[PDB]
Amino acid sequence: RPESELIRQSWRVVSRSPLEHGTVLFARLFALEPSLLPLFQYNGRQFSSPEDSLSSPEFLDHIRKVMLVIDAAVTNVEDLSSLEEYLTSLGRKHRAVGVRLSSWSTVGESLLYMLEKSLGPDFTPATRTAWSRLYGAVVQAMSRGWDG
Ligand code: HEM
């Protein structure tokens, strides 16, 4: 598919520096939804402010893990149903940590933003639409952790 390569070409840019880009994703995400901030409870302590997350080595490890999952979503963009059970259960983990169903769309907006930021003019209206479908397929999978 053409779309699937568009995701693949786009991702390449981001993939190179996962931490720098995921940092953007998370700063954006807390700007949009600041109530995600206390869900991280590294050392049984809440971050007070968004900037405190960036100083947390455990938080940065999480960014890396996030980018790795989006990475898997990319490598499997043509057949994404192979990631489904993983993503379901990652969703369930996240429900437990206290993330809402509604928060996942903000993560998708935040992913999208990180992408727009990184590709600048290369973030075509097609590139956008394709990414939105990919991550939507990721939430949709991460939302089956809310089931039963
Ligand atoms: C939406 C806001 C998010 C919050 C508040 C959040 C929070 C957390 C927390 C607190 C953990 C457990 C502590 C840790 O391993 O660092 C966790 C684990 C994880 N997160 Fe997130 N997360 C979010 C989004 C994401 C997204 C979008 C992804 C990937 C798409 C991601 C991927 C992971 C993975 C891979 C783990 C390890 C899970 C495991 O035990 O198997 N997270 N997250």
Numbering used by the authors: 3 to 150
Excerpt from the publication:
MPa - The F106W mutant crystal also seems to be more sensitive to pressure than the WT, but more resilient than the V101F mutant. There are no major differences between F106W HP-280 and F106W HP-310. In particular, the tunnel disappears already at 280 MPa and site I disappears at 310 MPa, while site II remains insensitive to pressure (data not shown). The protein mean B-factors are considerably raised by pressure, which could explain why this mutant is more sensitive to pressure than WT Ngb. The residues whose B-factors present a relevant increase with pressure (more than 15 Å2) are mostly located at the back of the protein, while the residues whose B-factors are moderately increased by pressure (less than 5 Å2) are mainly located close to the heme. The effect of pressure seems to be the opposite of what was previously observed in WT Ngb under pressure. In this mutant, the mechanical nucleus still coincides with the hinge region, but the whole protein behaves in a reverse way compared to WT-Ngb, with the zone close to the heme stabilized by pressure and the zone at the back of the protein destabilized by pressure.
To investigate the correlation between mechanical properties and functional efficiency in proteins, we selected neuroglobin (Ngb), a hexacoordinated heme protein, which is expressed in the neurons of vertebrates and is involved in neuroprotection in hypoxic conditions and protects brain from stroke. Ngb folds like all globins with a bundle of eight helices termed A to H, and a heme hexacoordinated in both ferric and ferrous forms by the imidazole side chain of the distal and proximal histidines (His 64 and His 96 respectively). The structures of human and murine Ngb present a large internal cavity behind the heme, that is connected to the surface through a tunnel, forming a pathway toward the heme for gaseous ligands (O2, CO, NO). Like many recently discovered globins, Ngb is characterized by endogenous heme iron hexacoordination in the absence of external ligands.
